[PDB]
Each structure stands twice: as structure tokens, then as C-alpha cells.
Design a protein around this ligand. Structure first.
Ligand SMILES: *[C@@H]1O[C@H](CO)[C@@H](O[C@@H]2O[C@H](CO)[C@@H](O)[C@H](O)[C@H]2NC(C)=O)[C@H](O)[C@H]1NC(C)=O
Ligand SMILES: *[C@@H]1O[C@H](CO)[C@@H](O[C@@H]2O[C@H](CO)[C@@H](O)[C@H](O)[C@H]2NC(C)=O)[C@H](O)[C@H]1NC(C)=O
Ligand SMILES: *[C@@H]1O[C@H](CO)[C@@H](O[C@@H]2O[C@H](CO)[C@@H](O)[C@H](O)[C@H]2NC(C)=O)[C@H](O)[C@H]1NC(C)=O
Ligand SMILES: *[C@@H]1O[C@H](CO)[C@@H](O[C@@H]2O[C@H](CO)[C@@H](O)[C@H](O)[C@H]2NC(C)=O)[C@H](O)[C@H]1NC(C)=O
Ligand SMILES: *[C@@H]1O[C@H](CO)[C@@H](O)[C@H](O)[C@H]1NC(C)=O
Ligand SMILES: *[C@@H]1O[C@H](CO)[C@@H](O)[C@H](O)[C@H]1NC(C)=O
Ligand SMILES: *[C@@H]1O[C@H](CO)[C@@H](O)[C@H](O)[C@H]1NC(C)=O
Ligand SMILES: *[C@@H]1O[C@H](CO)[C@@H](O)[C@H](O)[C@H]1NC(C)=O
Ligand SMILES: *[C@@H]1O[C@H](CO)[C@@H](O)[C@H](O)[C@H]1NC(C)=O
Ligand SMILES: *[C@@H]1O[C@H](CO)[C@@H](O)[C@H](O)[C@H]1NC(C)=O
Lengths: 812, 814
């Protein structure tokens, strides 16, 4: 009978010809089977419609509700590591540092060691791989490279903004696919996620299986089932999703519905309503937008009563108070009642200040990022609360409630733009309060002119009413973004909605089209004064500051603007920065010394002792120094290779250097020195202490010249900012370029954590040979010959300077 | 009909079950086919008993004369790189890939990577059985298999005695096989040969092919049909080889016979017969023993008339002539001039050792063997034949053959005086006349293997040469295998270079147990081991110490003239064996005498030259180890090659070549002794023939003379006629550190501008003179206010160090 036997192909011959043969279902069931007929030759791939019915030698689209795959394999569902996938970790213990199958997505390794996801496939015909990856953090470096059958080697992968797609072509011989991640770029993470692997060409033939539960395929020949929309039921092989009951809610593509939970107080978030014509703002309560709980269920608190009328907060400085806050014309400043017009002489202030929150300003945008799938829903991430701006309730406790301030351009004040040495284009601040309990991370990422976001700061744990001042270094459309995460733990539901960050105000200066609250008093032509000219509002004229004083371009107001230079330094031509001509001059009561470091003016470098990490990676820092001369311009420029695969101008710079062998390599450039506090023989100067105990005691006994630097930047670890001292030591035998030495007891660079103390032993640091630093030996006359000749002192500590006088002979 | 259809297997299912189905030969030929029947599941490999007919499920032995292969694949014919084999070469090395020479494949001689890659989809677990030849150790040959995940006993043994067999297990995954050879061990080659690759487990099933022509399989189910023996005819599929005609000869495993060529005069090699009882030998002619030519063919010269009676050469020194005219050693304790060995007095001593000058027959220790150039196997029949005055180099099977002569010594007895001194490295020597008459591309080899160890080529001569010699000094008592190998040419082609013949006129070896004597040494009477450093006079009969500044030569401690005065600046040690320098020189000028003291420089110091690249991608930088003075003048620089472990020479200066560790993956080799004696220490630039040029190094600013330590090496090589001479120049630098700075000449970075002399320069403060009592300033001061201050102060242009202390200041009232 026709139903008794099922047709079947024969084994391929040398020529590739094949035979289609009827075989009984039971071994030796019956006789009188149909004769064999030839068939296609191993290339019958129908590309996701391949039912490949044996009865008809053609590709017939198969029944609805059945994922047909294709001539390939899909790896969507990563409950565990799918069969054949190898997760290997190697150290250059990382047993736990393998690609963890978190769920529908697999995650990378955060620590600094290799983690390879290996798949070796016998791709019978040429095909492709379509791994869809998420690459947020540039710390981990992520590459995908395929080896041929001979195990022979565009591997490096792009950083992702906004899940990203990729495709690579494959040949027919035993391709092996590597997904490798090593977190060695920064040494400072955030894992890398890949999902939906799609190899093609594996099988030459496939049969369409019933569609997996929780998915539907209404149209026949569907390459893959459509994932079921939320709150809908779906069984395996169903033509379309069946809507679920009201009392039961199902997640996106969930086969089994679950009872809607009882509502709690944690599901609320309170907002201030927009001010009406009456001007009485009312507190309002709104349920979470992805609501899943049921209010009708017993034990669930109803929506709390809201609508208490209270006076609106006054309009922000720069907006004129229909009670709606809107900007008032430029050239005027507002205290809140009404913006008063400025005189022509006084200067308006450009920039945006956001203190009182009645509604999100125009540049403000708020978006939500999910922690389970990492897509930007963007419903409402931060809500206004009048005094502060709240952090709303997300879909889940892992959500990144993202607030973004985007400012297009910064108008530099005329005085600041005049000095090229000044690096400030404008600055931002905040009051990043928190009331967090555990495992939260407030991020403050800055992205200029559509460049990739780089996290300027990342606060963690509970904090207090604080602040932050980032100095923008370039004119660009910046995207100031603040990201709050309730918890790093992955758990179903909302738990830490009470752990709310707050931003009481975000003041930004020097913004084109900005409003003003300060009406700057400037000297009448105000106008750009010539370089290095102080400004008096009443004088209306530009005058040069007195010698040994440097004008601060930030606030060139009054004659008090420019500050006297520190000891041992002289002001440059622009009168902008105190610098040191390469000569120092120390005077003792017996004699006055004189030095000259013009041989040390060139930039010098030093690398610390390579110190291994907790993992197998070893790190050694690199410091670049500029000391004296060259009009006191910062000659040490220090960059970061790793991004290319920032640039800071400073007198001393530190860059971490990952070993070149590991990468197959600089990182974290910082400016250890941005000013010259002073040059003096004293150990302490203006709060910077250079410990004499760190270095070896000086044998000569003459004082050691100490250069006292200081850095402007204030970080989380450094309260007052980095302060570096370069100690100069007189050493006649050592080379003129000298030897640069970090302290012995701490080799990483800062056993204090913020102060980098150096030591420069050279002959240039030795005092200039004075006219009294030699021997006088007088002989009256021996046989009527006066021999008074002058010799250098063998305990020589001087170099250069005056020459030996010629021997003196004069008969008595 | 049964002949109309042939059964066949169906495609394997998920469960592994399979169906056997009869299919008509023609498409739709006829109906009424037999029903399917279940067949074998997955692997059913019969492993060379596999015919696997469809009628019977069991594997059957296929017909005779047919190789059944196995469940794998056999690669045997490398006329071209077989399909699937990849020959990838990386550092032009495009030509430096594995060349398919013929039945065997060869490696790359130059110094760059050459990989033979084969990637196989091994369905079931199996093995790879590659038979390889690894003569030279300069190339390093690795065989390592990568699994399906491309994941990594890689290094392979050296081969002697011919060809060796290796097997490695394999897995089910797609396995790729690497045969990699890089010639980066010694930098000084000889290729590496592999044959008969035999993968198993590839296909789960094979069909019984007919056996290739030129081979036979008489027994059914033969795993591989045997190669046809020589001079026999064989066609494909024949049950057994058919003997070939007399007129046509066929090589081993040759399907088609070839007519025997006409004989030429080049096929002869002449020999001297053994000395008969009459005592008159005769020249004899024997045809080339693997004869392939025909004498009956026209144009071929017959065997030359031989048998001219001439007197046998006299017996070698140490063998007594017999009435039977046969040479045989005579009793120990006597020396022979040839007529008869005269008994020696107890006061004189026999000389242990073997001398071979006159060739009537191969002595007992001699063996001669032939190595073929086509199959590299030791036929061993007769390579070198005797010719009276010289030992000939007879004709091999082919024109690429290695006619190998071997000398074997049981062990060497050190003379009592020599063994007394541990510093002496002499255990035995050797010598030869190594004439040649070669035309092109020959290579006389001299390899030495002691105590049955592996053979290392001590020397390798090439091209035409003349009557010469060589004196290798054996470094240890052992069983040595002195081997000579002569190759007619490197070109692979018949024989045409029978005229170009190496000859060895004499092979003298000293200090051999059971050895015969021709010199009857004179010792002083109790000859017994004299106390260390005692000269010997045969008439005196007493051991006396040599006078100071003289060192006794342990090789020839005869007479009072044995010990030679030491060179300038040196003093003899306690043993009076070697001149050494206590770390102090003393140069005197007419104005003042200097005094140095180098005790800070006694420790061994090292230096590496500037890394210089090869013509290929490899770069080499040398490593020199120096020992200068003190420590009783014992050679503190021991230098050894790493790579052989993956020799050790004691010398004052040693050069070793450091191949970079990155290339090897972990490497120093070619050690040599640049200095074995101290000729003398002097401020003169030339001393006893060693010249240390002043132009090489920068001129001295101080102006005081620079000491030039004058060394010298005993070894004489092909490149160095007189032996390497190294001079260490010491320069006074007050600023330089006490260990000092060591610098090679700037003109030649490799180390030697000349090619044999290594001049160094050591700048340090230790080389500076000791501060003399006259190397400072005296400054008399007449009493000013009745105060005299004649204080003493060092000279500002200081060039001294250490020495006398600066005197205290003077204060005396006038
Ligand atoms: C520091 O020493 C230098 C060298 O003696 C002084 O002289 C200058 O040297 C530089 C090269 O280093 C030359 O280019 C200048 O022409 C030299 N003269 C001057 C006036 O600069 C140098 O003057 C010393 N420093 C000071 C401040 O006097
Ligand atoms: C990254 O950039 C730095 C320079 O900023 C490079 O550093 C040099 O590396 C070489 C090789 O080790 C050293 O010889 C130099 O002394 C280094 N100079 C400095 C200033 O660091 C480094 O090579 C770059 N990394 C790359 C190209 O991978
Ligand atoms: C050269 O210098 C070394 C040390 O710098 C001297 O060595 C001393 O030798 C005496 C005996 O002669 C010992 O008692 C001392 O203990 C040695 N010194 C040290 C530090 O161990 C040596 O004498 C000097 N002169 C010569 C010719 O070698
Ligand atoms: C080959 O041998 C030489 C000396 O026998 C080794 O040279 C020293 O190796 C150590 C460790 O590798 C280094 O720290 C030294 O700097 C090397 N030189 C000296 C003078 O000590 C060499 O390492 C050996 N190479 C290998 C691969 O074993
Ligand atoms: C180190 O390896 C051992 C395996 O012996 C493992 O038990 C341990 O957890 C590893 N260390 C860490 C920090 O995981
Ligand atoms: C930011 O604060 C400064 C503090 O002096 C103030 O002058 C400035 O006006 C503020 N920014 C704006 C845009 O108002
Ligand atoms: C620089 O500032 C101007 C003025 O705000 C702005 O229009 C421009 O886009 C900025 N430069 C860039 C981002 O190229
Ligand atoms: C360099 O390689 C080329 C192949 O591109 C080859 O033709 C040439 O002979 C090589 N050079 C030498 C010196 O062999
Ligand atoms: C080797 O040559 C030397 C030459 O001095 C000779 O005295 C000695 O007898 C020779 N060897 C033998 C074993 O005769
Ligand atoms: C050393 O020489 C003796 C001489 O009789 C010999 O028997 C012995 O085998 C030699 N040493 C070795 C290790 O073979």
C-alpha cells in the first residue's frame, strides 16, 4: 500500500547521482514496491522553504505553523551552551570567566583574560553567519574570525550604540568560528552580548518541525516563527496566538500565562503636573507604564489620592514668568520675577541653567533602557518633582533610566578664546544625590558631535548631596547623559524603586542661545582686550598686569584677576601661565648658588616596574615630563592608542601601557601637572609636601632643587587633585640627560594615591661653578719664583661656569 | 535479471539504520526488483580484507592481485604533491617548499618554515603512520596534529641506521596534519625525507582496486601488493611477477623493462689482491657489483687484463711480517719498522695506537659500507677498496652514492703524564691524507661518534683538494666511530664520476688499547707517572720540577726541553702546566713605573653583538664569554649549546651563536674556543705574531698605554689557517663602572673583521694605574703670617685609582 512504504534517497555515488527508493515502514512488511527513480545531486537547498517532499521532486512550501529553518541551523535559545559550542578561557581563576549563558542572550567575561566561544561546523556548501552582537563597553575587545579547514586565520568588531547585526561569508571546508573577548584595553566592566547565531549551508536538506510553543507561523513557508506578542497565549504548532485571559498576563513570547500579581506601593511614581492657568501645581500619581499587576485584586493599594494644589516653583534663571516658563530675549538677566535688560557695557551670560523643575526643558530628553534585553523603550525615565528631578520606575529593577541633556554649541567668551593655552570651552555641574541601598550605578557619559559615548564618571552606592564639574575641551554638539540603574541583579519585578537618584540642578555655561542670570561687568570698548590685559568695569580700558602675575581667563574682572607667580617662576609674554626659565638661583649667607637646567628642557620619559595584576595581565605605567624653558608651553602630549588600534597637554603626564605582546597599547592618559606652584629648596610649598624620606639621602649636602607642580582636575579618589614634585639632584658623574627615578618603596607611581614624586639625578642640576668654588694656594717665592695656581676642588659639585685662572708667576 | 540490477545502500538515517536496495543498471530498466533488506550500521571496516560485496553482508577477501587498501588512504607516489596535500612555506621561500623529489619527498634546506599540511575528515578514530628520514639536525622536524577545534610529542627524533617509523593516534574530528621543518638550529644543509603516509579510518568502506603495474599480490586479501623484485616484469593486476628477459633489466618495482646499456670503462674499479704465499700480489679488476650493463653487446670494453705480479707493500708499523706474508700484530711491548718488531727495554715504553699506512687488506677495525642516493639505505657491500699506496674510493650503485669508510677504536689509554694534568683536554688524535681528484659537487665527510653516540660531522670538505691532512683531538675516552663519506655528486641522475676519486694515504690514531707501536718512547726510570709538573730525562731516571716561568707540555714530556718559558706578564701555576696572569701588570717608564691590578675584572663577563639579519628572515647575534685573569688561571668560561637538548668548551674567551628565542619558541649553538692560551700581556701592539690594530678602536684621550692581552687558540680549521687569535684591549676610564664596558670593533658587527681574530676592548676604572706616590700635586707655601700649608692634592686630570692615600695637609711654623 502507498501508506505502507515511504520513499527514501540512496547514498551518493562518486558521480553524485542518487536514487529515490520506496522502503516499507516495517522490515520486510510487503512486496511489490515501486521502482527507483533518479533525483537531484546534493544541492537541493530551498532556503527556508525546504520541505523537500520525496513524492514530488520539488521544494513544496510546508504547512502553516512550522518553522522551516533552512539549509542551516539557528541558535536563538541559549538556556545552556548549545550542543557543539565550546567556551574556553585561557590566562596569558578564569574557570568562571567563560561566556555565561545568561538567557536568550549570552554574556562575555568582565575580567581581563581570554574567553573564546568556539563553534566548528562542517559547512557542506558555502554559507554565512549572522551573529547579532551588543558591544557597549570599549574595555573588552571583541573580534570574530573564522578559520578554514587548514586552520588558517576584518576580525576586529565595531563598538555598538543605540544590538547590531553582522555577516561573514564561509567556504565549504570545516569552518570554525571564534567569538573572543579580552578585557585588557583599559585595565580600569560591562559584558558583551551576542544572540541569534545563524549558520547556513550545513545540511543540504531539512524538514520543517512544528513551531515552538510561544510562537506562531500564520503564513506557510515562513523562514522563522513570529515571536508572540505580550499577554497572549500560544501552544506549539498553533496557527496564531490565542489571546490570554484578563487575570493572566504573559511576557513577550511566553507560552504559559501567569496570574497578574497584587499591586504594591512600589509600583507608583509621583510627578508634578504642568502648571495650569491658575498656577497651582498638583502632585500626580501614575502607574508604571509596563503595568503587570491588578488593582481589583485584594491586598493591593489603590491609586493614592493626588491633586493637592501648591504654588508652582518660580521660573528658572533666564526665563520670563499664562504662568508658563519661556525664555526672554537675550541681553537681559532674570532673577525669576522678570528679566531686567542689561546695559550695553555689561556682558550677557551664555549658557543653560536648570534648577526648578516644572517640566522637562526643550533640550532635556528622558529614555528608559531595559536590563533584560537592552533596547531603548524611552517611555519616561526621569520625572520632575519641583525641587529635584526624580528617577522614574522602569519596566524592571535592572533598567537604565537615562536622562540626556544635549547642548549643540558653546560660545567662548572673548577673553578666554584669546589665550590658546586655556583649554576650557565650557563646564557642567549637578547635585547627584542618591538614596540608594545596594548595587546601583549612576553614570555621567559625555558624547561630543555624535562621537561614541565615553563614561566621564561612574558613581556607585549610596551618596550624598554632592556635585561635579567637567570642563568641556572642544566645541561640539555634546550629549550629556545620566544613567541610573536600580540594581545589577537580574530578578523578575520591581524591588528597589525607593532607591532613587536625584539631580537638584544641572548648570551649564557658555552655550549658544543661552539664557543669563549673571550680567558680566566688562570694560567698555565690552570687547576683546589684547592678550594679557586685565579688565576694570569702571575704567573701560585694557591694561597689562604687572610682572610676575598671570591673568586667569575664566574671570578677568577687576584688577584682582591676575595672581602673582610662585617662587622661582616668571610670567610669559602673554602673561597667561607662570613658567620657569631654566635657571634657578638659591642664595646662602656665605655664597649665592646659580643653576641652569637648559640641558633638561627637553621632554623625558620613564616607565615604572612592570607589576602584575590579580589576573595574568601585567601593567607598567609610562610618565612623560617637561620641566623648564620653551616659553613654558606644555611640551608633553600624551595619547591613547587603544581606541585607534585622549590627548592631554601637561608638564608631567602618566599613561598606563598594556604590554605589546598581550595585544599582539597605551591607556588612561591623565595630566599629573598643569601648573607650576613654585620652585624652591623647601620641602613644603603651598600645601604640596615632597617627602625627603622617600628617596635616598643626599651625600653632597647641598640642597635638592624641588619643582612643585599641581593638577587642576578633581576626581573621586583625589579630593584636592594630583600634585607632583620633581626633585633635582646634583650628580657630577651621571649623564647630562640624567636619570629619572620613581620612589623605591612605591613603584606603581602613587603610594599616596594622588602625588607623583620624582627624582632627576644629573650633572645639569649641579650649581654653576662659582668664582669662589676652587682652591687658592699661594707661595711667596721659592728660589725667587711665586707659584700661586688655582685648582678645582676634588669634592666637585659644580659644572660649567667660570674657568680655572691660569697659573700665576711673578718674581718677588 | 540478477545481472540487470546491483544492490546499493541507502542514505544513513538519524538512528544509523541503513537499507540495502537493488537498483537497475539502466534508469528504469525493468521491474520486479528484490525487496530491501537491512544492512550494516555505520562503521563496518574490514581493514584490508574489505571487499564488502552487496550479496553477502560480511566483508570478503577480494581477488588475488588486487590491493584492498583499508578503511583509510595510503599516499605513496609523490610524483606530484597528491591531491589535498598543501605545501605552505613562510619566512624568496617560494621555492623553499617540500619538493616532491620522487618516491620520497624532501624538506627545505634554507632557514625558513616549510609545512606539509593535510586535512582529513577522519570518520572513525585511526592512526597516521609516516616513515621519515632525519639525517641532519640543523633542520628541526615536527609532526603535530590539530583537532576539529584547531587546538594544538611534537618534536621528532634524529634518525640513524636508515629510515624510521612513527605512528600517532587520531580522533573522529576533522584532523589536520602538519609536517614542519625549519633549518634554524645551527645557522651553518641536508633535507628531511618522509614516505608512506598511511591514514586509516577515512571512509568506513573501500572497494578492492586492481594492484598497480610493477607490483604483485599472489595472496588474496593482500593489505598492499608487494613491489616487484628487480629485473622482473609485472603488469597491473598480475597474480605474480613475470621474469624479464636477459637483454632487458628493470629496477625494483618497475613495470616496464629497459634494454641493458652497453658497458663502458667507467663501470670498473681496480683493486690489489691479498698477498699470496708467494708474496707477489696482483692488480685485479671487478665489474660494478650492481651490474646493469652487458659485455656481449658491441661497443663495450671487456674486463681489462689483470694479474701483473708485483711485490706486496711491507706490513704496517706494528705488525710483524710472517713467512706466510700475512700482516698481523706482534706482541705488546715492541716496535716495528716493517722488517721485524724489535723488543723494547723496560726503560722505554710502547706507543699505544693504531697506524694504517700500507693497504693490502682492510684491517680488522676497518669496515666499508655503501649508502645509496636513491633510497638512502645502507647496502654496505664494498665502498672503499685498497690500492697499496692509497685506499681507493670504489664505484657505488649510483652516481649519488655515499661510499662510507668507517674506523672503530675500542678505547684510548692516556699516557700517565697526560692524565696527571686535568687541564689538558687531549685523550687521542687522528690524521689522514685526504686527497681528492674530484670534478664537481662532491663532498668528503668526516663524522665522529664516540661511545656509540650519534654522528656529528666534525669536518666537511668540498670540491677538488690536494694532498693534505687533518688532526682532530678526541675530547673523551670512548668507543669512537671515525667515518669517512664520499659522494660523487649531489645531482640525481647511471654513473659518470668514477674518475673523481677520494684517496686516503694514511690514517694515524694514537692512544688506542691493544694498539701497535712504532715509536718506543723514552721515559725516566722509576717509567711511572711523575709528580705533577715534573720534566722527564731518559738518562736521569728521576722526575724534576721545571724552573719558574716555564710550563710543561703534557703531550711530549721528553728531555729538559719539554717545558717552555712563559710569555711576558704571565707566571706559571702550581702544577706548572699553563701560563696564567695574576691580576697585575707592571709597566715601567723611564720617569716612573706603573702598577695595575685587575682583581675586579677576574670574574667572567659576557657580551652580545649587534643582531645582524641573514639573507633570509632569520637574524643572528653572537655571544662571547670572557675570562681574563686570576683564579689560578683556570678557564672559567664554560659554553654549551642549548639546542641539542631543546658541546661544552672550556676557554678564556668563547664565541657561541645565539639564535633568537622568539623564532624557536623557547637556542644557542655552534660553541667554539676563541682562546686557549695566554701568549703574553704587553703594551706592544704586536706579540708573537698576533696583531691588535690601533685603527679599529677609538684613539685614547688619556695618552697612557692600553694593555693588550694576547690570547691564541690551538684549533686549526678550514677558514683559519693558523688558528683564532683574540686580543682583549684594556683601557683606563675613571668614569666607567668597575665591572666595565666591553665593546667589539665598530667596523665589523659580527665580531671579526679579518675572519679569525676577535679583538675586544674593556673600558673600566680597574684598568687604570694604581695611584702612585708621585701621581699628585705638591704645593709648597711660604709661611704667610708664620703658617706653612704645603697641602697635597690629587691631580685634576686624574687617571689613577686605588693605590696610595692622599697625604694629610701640612701645618708647621717657620
Ligand atoms: C644655560 O646654559 C646655556 C649653555 O651654556 C646658556 O647659553 C645658551 O645655550 C643655548 C644652547 O643650550 C644656546 O642656543 C644659546 O644661544 C645660549 N645663550 C643664551 C643667551 O641663551 C644659557 O644662557 C643658560 N641659561 C641661562 C638662563 O642663562
Ligand atoms: C602606543 O603609543 C606609544 C607612544 O605613545 C608607543 O610607545 C613606544 O613603544 C616603543 C616600543 O615598545 C618604545 O620603544 C617607545 O619608547 C615607546 N614610546 C612611548 C612614548 O611610549 C607604543 O609603541 C604604541 N603602541 C602600539 C603602536 O601598539
Ligand atoms: C688587587 O686588589 C685585590 C682587592 O681589590 C687585592 O686582594 C687582596 O689580596 C690580599 C692578599 O694579597 C688579601 O689579604 C685581601 O683580602 C684581598 N682583598 C680583598 C678585598 O679580598 C689584591 O691584593 C690586589 N693586588 C693584586 C696583585 O691582586
Ligand atoms: C641558551 O643558553 C644561554 C646560556 O647558556 C642562555 O643565556 C641566558 O639565559 C637567561 C635565561 O633565559 C637570561 O636571563 C640571560 O640573560 C642569558 N644570558 C646570560 C649571559 O646569562 C639562554 O637563555 C639559553 N636559551 C634557551 C632558550 O635556553
Ligand atoms: C582556582 O582554581 C581552583 C581549582 O583548583 C578553583 O577551585 C578556585 O575557585 C580558583 N580560584 C578562583 C578565585 O576562582
Ligand atoms: C552657573 O553658576 C555660576 C556660578 O557663578 C553662575 O554665574 C552662572 O550663571 C550659572 N550658569 C547659568 C547658565 O546661569
Ligand atoms: C561649533 O560651534 C558652533 C556654534 O554653536 C556650532 O554651530 C558648530 O556646530 C560647532 N562645531 C562643530 C560641532 O563642528
Ligand atoms: C622573490 O619572490 C619572487 C616571487 O614573487 C621570485 O620570483 C624571486 O625569484 C624571489 N627572489 C629571489 C632572489 O629568489
Ligand atoms: C703517528 O704519527 C707519529 C708522528 O710523530 C708517529 O710517531 C706515530 O708512530 C704514529 N702512530 C702510530 C700508531 O704509529
Ligand atoms: C674507556 O677506555 C677503556 C679502555 O679499556 C674502555 O674499556 C672503556 O669502555 C672506555 N670508556 C667507556 C665509557 O666506554
Amino acid at each position: 500500500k502507498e501508506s505502507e512504504y515511504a520513499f527514501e534517497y540512496t547514498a551518493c555515488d562518486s558521480t553524485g547521482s542518487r536514487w529515490r527508493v520506496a522502503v516499507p515502514a516495517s522490515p520486510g512488511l510487503c512486496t511489490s514496491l515501486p521502482d527507483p527513480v533518479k533525483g537531484t545531486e546534493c544541492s537541493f537547498s530551498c532556503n527556508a522553504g525546504e520541505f523537500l517532499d520525496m513524492k514530488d521532486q520539488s521544494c513544496k512550501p510546508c504547512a502553516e505553523g512550522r518553522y522551516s529553518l533552512g539549509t542551516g541551523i539557528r541558535f536563538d535559545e541559549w538556556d545552556e551552551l548549545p550542543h557543539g559550542f565550546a567556551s574556553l578561557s585561557a590566562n596569558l581563576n578564569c574557570t568562571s570567566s567563560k561566556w555565561v549563558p545568561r538567557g536568550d542572550y549570552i554574556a562575555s567575561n568582565t575580567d581581563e583574560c581570554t574567553a573564546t566561544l568556539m563553534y566548528a561546523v562542517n559547512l557542506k556548501q558555502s554559507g554565512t553567519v549572522n551573529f547579532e552582537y551588543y558591544y557597549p563597553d570599549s574595555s573588552i575587545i571583541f573580534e570574530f574570525f573564522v578559520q578554514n579547514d587548514q586552520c588558517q586565520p576584518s576580525r576586529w568588531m565595531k563598538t555598538t550604540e543605540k544590538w547590531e547585526f553582522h555577516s561573514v561569508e564561509l567556504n565549504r571546508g570545516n569552518n570554525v568560528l571564534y567569538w573572543r573577548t579580552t578585557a585588557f584595553s583599559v585595565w580600569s566592566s560591562k559584558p558583551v552580548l551576542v544572540r541569534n547565531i545563524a549558520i547556513t549551508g550545513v545540511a543540504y536538506t531539512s524538514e520543517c518541525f512544528p513551531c515552538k510553543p510561544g510562537t506562531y507561523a500564520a503564513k506557510q513557508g515562513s523562514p522563522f516563527c513570529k515571536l508572540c506578542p505580550a499577554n497572549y497565549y500560544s501552544n506549539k504548532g498553533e496557527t496564531s496566538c490565542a489571546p490570554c485571559d484578563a487575570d493572566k498576563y504573559s511576557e513577550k513570547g511566553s507560552s504559559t500565562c501567569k496570574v497578574r500579581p497584587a499591586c504594591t506601593d512600589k509600583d507608583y511614581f509621583y510627578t508634578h503636573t504642568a502648571c495650569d492657568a491658575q498656577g497651582e501645581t498638583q502632585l500626580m500619581y501614575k502607574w508604571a507604564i509596563p503595568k503587570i499587576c491588578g488593582e481589583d485584586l485584594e491586598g493591593a493599594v489603590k491609586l493614592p489620592a493626588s491633586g493637592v494644589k501648591t504654588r508652582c516653583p518660580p521660573c528658572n534663571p533666564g526665563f520670563f514668568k499664562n504662568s508658563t516658563c519661556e525664555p526672554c530675549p537675550y541681553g537681559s538677566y532674570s532673577n525669576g520675577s522678570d528679566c531686567t535688560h542689561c546695559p550695553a557695557g555689561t556682558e550677557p551670560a551664555v549658557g543653560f541653567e536648570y534648577k526648578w523643575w516644572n517640566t522637562l526643558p526643550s533640550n532635556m530628553e528622558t529614555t528608559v533602557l531595559s536590563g533584560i534585553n537592552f533596547e531603548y523603550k524611552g517611555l519616561t525615565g526621569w520625572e520632575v518633582a519641583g525641587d529635584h528631578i526624580y528617577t522614574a520606575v522602569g519596566a524592571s529593577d535592572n533598567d537604565f533610566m537615562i536622562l540626556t541633556l544635549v547642548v549643540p554649541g558653546f560660545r567662548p567668551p572673548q577673553s578666554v578664546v584669546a589665550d590658546t593655552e586655556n583649554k576650557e570651552v565650557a563646564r557642567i555641574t549637578f547635585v547627584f544625590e542618591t538614596i540608594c541601598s545596594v548595587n546601583c550605578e549612576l553614570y555621567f557619559m559625555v558624547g561630543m558631535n555624535s562621537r561614541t559615548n565615553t563614561p566621564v564618571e561612574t558613581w556607585k552606592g549610596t551618596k550624598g548631596k554632592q556635585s561635579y564639574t567637567y570642563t568641556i575641551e572642544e566645541n561640539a554638539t555634546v550629549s550629556f547623559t545620566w544613567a541610573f540603574q536600580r540594581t545589577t541583579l537580574h530578578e523578575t519585578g520591581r524591588k528597589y524603586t525607593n532607591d532613587v537618584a536625584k539631580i537638584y540642578s544641572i548648570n551649564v555655561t557658555n552655550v549658544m542661545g543661552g539664557v543669563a542670570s549673571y550680567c558680566r561687568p566688562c570694560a567698555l570698548e565690552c570687547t576683546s582686550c589684547p592678550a594679557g590685559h586685565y579688565i576694570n568695569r569702571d575704567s573701560g580700558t585694557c591694561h597689562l598686569c604687572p610682572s610676575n602675575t598671570i591673568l586667569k581667563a575664566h574671570q578677568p574682572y577687576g584688577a584682582q584677576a591676575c595672581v602673582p607667580c610662585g617662587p622661582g617662576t616668571k610670567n610669559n609674554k602673554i602673561h597667561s601661565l607662570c613658567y620657569n626659565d631654566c635657571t634657578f638661583s638659591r642664595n646662602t649667607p656665605s655664597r649665592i648658588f646659580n643653576y641652569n637646567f637648559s640641558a633638561l628642557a627637553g621632554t623625558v620619559s620613564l616607565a615604572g616596574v612592570p607589576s602584575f595584576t590579580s589576573k595574568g595581565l601585567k601593567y607598567f605605567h609610562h610618565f612623560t615630563l617637561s620641566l623648564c624653558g620653551n616659553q613654558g608651553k606644555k611640551m608633553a602630549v600624551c595619547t591613547d592608542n587603544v581606541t585607534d588600534l585622549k590627548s592631554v597637554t601637561a608638564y608631567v603626564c602618566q599613561v598606563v601601557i598594556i604590554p605589546s605582546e598581550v595585544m599582539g597599547v597605551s591607556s588612561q592618559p591623565v595630566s599629573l601637572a598643569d601648573r607650576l606652584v613654585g620652585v624652591s629648596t623647601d620641602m613644603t610649598l603651598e600645601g604640596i609636601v615632597s617627602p625627603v624620606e622617600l628617596f635616598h639621602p643626599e651625600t653632597s649636602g647641598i640642597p635638592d632643587i624641588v619643582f612643585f607642580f599641581r593638577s587642576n582636575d578633581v576626581t573621586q579618589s583625589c579630593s584636592s587633585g594630583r600634585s607632583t614634585t620633581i626633585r633635582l639632584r646634583c650628580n657630577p658623574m651621571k649623564a647630562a640627560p640624567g636619570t629619572l627615578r620613581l620612589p623605591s618603596m612605591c613603584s606603581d607611581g602613587t603610594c599616596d594615591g594622588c602625588n607623583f614624586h620624582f627624582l632627576w639625578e644629573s650633572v645639569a642640576a649641579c650649581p654653576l661653578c662659582s668664582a669662589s668654588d676652587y682652591h687658592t694656594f699661594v707661595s711667596s717665592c721659592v728660589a725667587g719664583i711665586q707659584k700661586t695656581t688655582y685648582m678645582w676642588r676634588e669634592p666637585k659639585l659644580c659644572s660649567g661656569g667660570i674657568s680655572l685662572p691660569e697659573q700665576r708667576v711673578t718674581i718677588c
